[PDB]
């Protein structure tokens, strides 16, 4: 298939967190997925993510290196890189 | 005093987590503190971070951009910048629970 895959590396997966480094080449996509845990995103590169909602509507979100944000369990989205730059962020999922 | 204060900004703080951005200018220190929460360090820049143990001995943590690591509640240290470059990292502390 033509869709380019997002790359992931799990850096930590202990009793507190699962930390995954995500790298999205230009023209890649995570595919739609569902979040089962609250999480923090730490962007490692400046960029522009495309977020596709379950209904197909689309939004762009700016990532700024070192500017973290928090999200709750239940988020459902496809994250795509429609930009010319590799997107890089760490996702820190918050375990119980 | 001649030591420069470390700078901190709390980016996120909620019932599950606290995320603090630490910026240490050359010649700065956090001051000795203890950690009451397990945490994760995310270095935002390569650096050499001085860690002063309770016994006064020092070591130089080798921080690599984007290479996170985990630490346990109970850590007691002063962290300093004796290098020529600003040190920057996020610290992500987990709440109970
Ligand atoms: Ca624990
Ligand atoms: Ni996601
Ligand atoms: Ni500390």
Experimental method: X-ray
CB pairs under 8 A between A and B: 60
- Whether the CB of A70 is below 8 Å from some CB of chain B: the reply is yes
- Whether the CB of B27 is below 8 Å from some CB of chain A: the reply is no
> Which 8-state DSSP code applies to residue A51?
E
Count of beta carbons in the 10 Å neighbourhood of residue A10: 11
* Exposure class string for B65-93: b at 16+ Cβ within 10 A, else e: ebebebeeeeeebbbbbeeeeebbbbbbb
Question: What 3-state class would DSSP assign to A37?
Answer: coil
How far apart (Å, rounded) are the C-alpha atoms in residues B38 and B92?
A: 8
- Whether the CB of A10 is below 8 Å from some CB of chain B: the reply is no
CATH of A1-96, one of 2.60.120.10, 3.40.50.720, 3.30.70.890, 3.40.50.300: 2.60.120.10
Report the separation in Å between the CA atom of A3 and the middle of ligand 2, taken as the mean of its atom positions: 17
Look up the CATH number of domain B1-97.
Answer: 2.60.120.10
Question: B67: nearest CA in chain A?
Answer: A11
Resolution (A): 1.1
Contact yes or no for B40 and A65 at CB 8 A: no
> Which 8-state DSSP code applies to residue B46?
-
């Amino acid at each position: 298939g033509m869709t380019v895959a997002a790359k992931s590396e799990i850096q930590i997966d202990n009793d507190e967190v699962r930390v995954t480094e995500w790298r999205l080449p230009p023209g890649s996509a995570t595919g739609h997925h569902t979040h089962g845990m609250d999480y923090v995103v730490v962007p490692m590169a400046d960029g522009e993510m495309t977020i596709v909602a379950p209904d197909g509507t689309r939004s762009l979100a700016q990532l700024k290196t070192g500017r973290s944000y928090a999200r709750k369990a239940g988020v459902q989205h496809d994250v795509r890189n429609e930009s010319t730059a590799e997107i890089v962020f760490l996702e820190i999922e918050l375990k119980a």
